[model samples]
Target: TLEAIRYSRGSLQILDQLLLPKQSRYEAVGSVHQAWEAIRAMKVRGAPAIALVGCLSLAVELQAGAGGPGLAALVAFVRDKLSFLVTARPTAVNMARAARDLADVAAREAEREGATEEAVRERVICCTEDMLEKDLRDNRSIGDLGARHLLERVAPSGGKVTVLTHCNTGALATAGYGTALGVIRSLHSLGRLEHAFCTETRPYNQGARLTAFELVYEQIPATLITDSMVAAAMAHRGVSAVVVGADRVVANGDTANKVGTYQLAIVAKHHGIPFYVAAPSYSCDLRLETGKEIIIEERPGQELTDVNGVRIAAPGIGVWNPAFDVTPHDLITGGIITELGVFAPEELRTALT
Candidate 1:
């Protein structure tokens, strides 16, 4: 329950995410351009965080609503400013889209039928605030649904359930209840979580550092295992399911998630474990026909060579660190638990699109 802390740094400040899990701190962005850098570099991330930042940027554009030589001039001015922020991470569609959505709302309200500039500006702020609040509510709904399904699956007898998860889908990764980790929390809250087997989530240790810390912080049963040991764990230890977070999910129900997710699903299938993907509706991409069409972001090789700043591989050794992997619809058992309700992989296309 203590995981509901989310914030907005306004247009003048940027959130310090790299210092996460060690220090919960923030740094101010001196100018609009600086804010763009923060957004691009993922100083502030998660769909809702980016959405809030974009909306706030528009809010600080003081001349946006007034028709007094202000309305026409301000819209042009702010739109240009927002367009620049969109480039921070071109691979991420949320940046420009959310910015435009909020900006348009503010612009229309200010220029709406028989509306005064003051009223419109107030409405814009309200819209942005509502967006922020709604994101949190949506996150909770995701948690509730995923947790419900998990409890029913593993501990139908009302005991504990063992789960395997990947990456860093925890409170720090989202506005409130995390995608994959949220499912774990829901299970834990219902007294159904027995143990969570966390993968090292190579190239970043997101699972080892973040997910593990979150589980410990929440006082849930958690264990750290090398990424390679997953299949064996499933074979001998009896893991009932595998849950992971996604970066993007196509309308067709194909998902692009952490690099190891596909492999985990494969292992789970062989071990007879039900694999589940827990993501918010926002993660769905109705535009993409399939996961193959989705662009995969690649990272430098050095990331795979290190663990917590310690070298595990040779300095110049080649490494491949693709940000995500596609978990085929056929590989997963159930596409669990979203704000809209659970749907089978095939049923997802109809529900989402």
Candidate 2:
């Protein structure tokens, strides 16, 4: 429903979140160079979104007949462009993974019998276009599957389940729909959702703005709570489950997500509530054995001290702002809800591979 990266055959555009509730605008990205600069500056926010824009930009260029003087040179050109795009947000494995796959498509097509330069370029473009569709389709699958599992676990007799979530993991943050937030959407659609609680996601207050924006815009029943208010909210709000997005789900299923998520998982455990990780299989990093190996992105401390360009904290107060926290697999009591289906943490690696 929410088009983060809008694409057609020859034209492409990205929704610039830089001007969020304060303003809203769509910037045209006509070339791989423009997409790289926009992605480097994160004009298009979200992991899958950055990857989508990058590949599609190349598709736009290729559709205009822009690649390869010869077959070998053409495949090399596609590979080079994808590698450059990966550098924009190197930590994001989505684009990196997509780059490899797209590059392989180019090489494989070039190697085929009777392959023309035109055919190789067209193959790359078509594969890139398919990725956008796959992202949207996968999110819906995740939502439906996650909703069924959550309802069965929390509302076995068919009453209703109130779910609490963190961060802005929605249409704004993904291809469309969402992962964790999508699960809530499915529940609401089934008339099994009693309410939704979104954390403030402070330092940047990302959740307060984006997550709340999506809920209010969609007219879903939701309330915004400060990060510290989670325990209190769960105590009184009939919170049956905690669902959150993941940045990285490691080999052993130790997850890294927004800074407040780890605390939420701990609080949910204490309250005897189920906690689930809503993520795509690509979000899994099989190479990393545990969360300790994951490197977190730390934002400017001014994000904590300043609000809407007004200083809140006292002048010269030392601050440390880490953007994410690692939640051990054991705390993921409700399992990882993926498009492939849900699985317990210990079974995640085996299931994925």
Candidate 3:
């Protein structure tokens, strides 16, 4: 699997996604400031991957003795640093949840009897490290569970299945393995996958640049298509189902994913194809009762007007570039594929709880 972020006792590095498909380079991130910049710039992205990088970057800094002289000061520093990291990208629920949990850990550790500054730092670092391991394991579970469910649902007649996916949900986007992409991997491993189609997610090209690169690397039978070609492909091509990764899945199973996902889900429903959302439990925010309550992140207009720093659109043209869009629960006709198990949109809240 591709390595998006690398971490050790005190060293941290991330693959620069902005130069992907053409260049594969790993740059060092020694401080929380650098991690924040990389995430904001999308050099490292995806919900789970971003949270892992943010928390691990802080762990690296803390290992270098960046914290304070006393327990109180150290706890305050940890909380402040995590809060700052959450501001880098507002849409992903992973970072916000992690920030709350890690800050709570630091505070509780500091309150322990005879707690030292070093002990508090180690507690936080260990907690962050555990997240990396947990995410990787959860992804594999999601892959296996999702693959079994999708195969049974879409290919119960005993034949190979073709899956259409949006955005980059491979190893580059998560701790390891993948979410929706991992389900594809599992299907391929079982010799039950006929093919895969990845869309060229616009304004960012995460699907075109990243997902295509991953599929080619693994020698998976796959094709890349423009975002607008999805419906046409479904009509002519053998698209059995649609699976996608999510930034957030609300209480009702309304999912927020890459910008083109809402339209993709609508098309899938029209074609009578099953549409699945593959996400970890960490990505689910039950507090948000509906999709409308989920805050969508609007990116800079320059992203839509330029391609690799070259202007592609006409001058003075207005742009509305939202980083993601919500796919309503009804369009998730297949099921919510998670590490736990597959659940219908209405069953998500109870199953997750």
lDDT, each prediction:
0.72, 0.90, 0.91
Q: Candidate 2 — which residues are off by over 4 angstroms?
A: 295-297
The sequence of per-residue lDDT tens digits that candidate 1 reaches over residues 191-241 is 777789999887777887678778877888889998999989999887888
lDDT of 2 by residue, 200-261 (tens): 89877778888888888778899999999999999998999999999889989899999989
Model 3 lDDT, residue 4, Cα = 85
Shift of residue 55 alpha carbon in model 1, Å: 2.4
In model 3, where do residues sit more than 4 Å from their true spots? 68-70, 90-93, 292-302, 311-323
Lowest lDDT block of 10, candidate 1: 2-11
TM-scores for every predicted model: 0.85, 0.94, 0.88
Write down the RMSD of all candidates, one decimal each. 3.4, 1.8, 2.7
* Candidate 3's TM-score: 0.88
Name the lDDT value of residue 144 in candidate 2: 91
lDDT for 111 (candidate 1): 72
Colliding pairs, model 2: none
| Candidate 3: clashing residue pairs, number | 0
